[PDB]
Amino acid sequence: SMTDLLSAEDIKKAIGAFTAADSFDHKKFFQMVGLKKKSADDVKKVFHILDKDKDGFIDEDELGSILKGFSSDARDLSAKETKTLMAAGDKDGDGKIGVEEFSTLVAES
C-alpha cells in the first residue's frame, strides 16, 4: 500500500490540500506527501503503484487517478488537471509518463 512508502499523516495532509476540482499543484503535492525526500528506489515504487496496468507508463487515464493512488477515497483529477499534469511530466513527447520522467517531475521545486 502507499503507506508502506509514505506516512498516512503526510498523505492525508497532501490529499487534504487539493479536494477542490482544478486545485492540483504537483510541486506542492509531492513536497507535502513527503516523497521529495525518498530514495530514487522508493520513488520508483510510487511510480509502479500509479502505473496501474504496469506497462511502464502512466498514461492520461491512469494519471487522472493519481490521487487515488495515494488515498483510495480521493477524487479523480479534472480533465483540465490531467492534461496540464501530463504536459508537465511528459517531456520526451509520447503522451505519457515513464519512470525517469516521473523522478524528474517529483524532483522539481
* Residues near 43 by beta carbon (within 8 Å), at least 6 away in sequence: 35, 102, 103, 106
Residues contacting Ca ion: total by CB under 5 A = 6
Q: How many angstroms separate the first and last alpha carbons of the chain? A: 26
Rounded CA separation 107/36 (Å): 6
**Rule CB under 5 A: is residue 51 a binding residue for Ca ion?**
yes
Site for Ca ion (CB under 5 A): which residue of 92, 100, 107, 108? 92
Of all residues in this chain, which one has the CB nearest to Ca ion in the complex?
A: 90
Rounded CA separation 78/10 (Å): 23
**Rule CB under 5 A: is residue 55 a binding residue for Ca ion?**
yes
Site for Ca ion (CB under 5 A): which residue of 2, 70, 90, 102? 90
Site for Ca ion (CB under 5 A): which residue of 94, 100, 107, 108? 94
| Structure letter (DSSP) for residue 42 | H
**Rule CB under 5 A: is residue 69 a binding residue for Ca ion?**
no
**Rule CB under 5 A: is residue 61 a binding residue for Ca ion?**
no
Going by their DSSP bridges, the two strands 97-98 and 57-58 should be labelled as: antiparallel
Residue 8 Cβ, how far from Ca ion at the closest point, in Å? 25
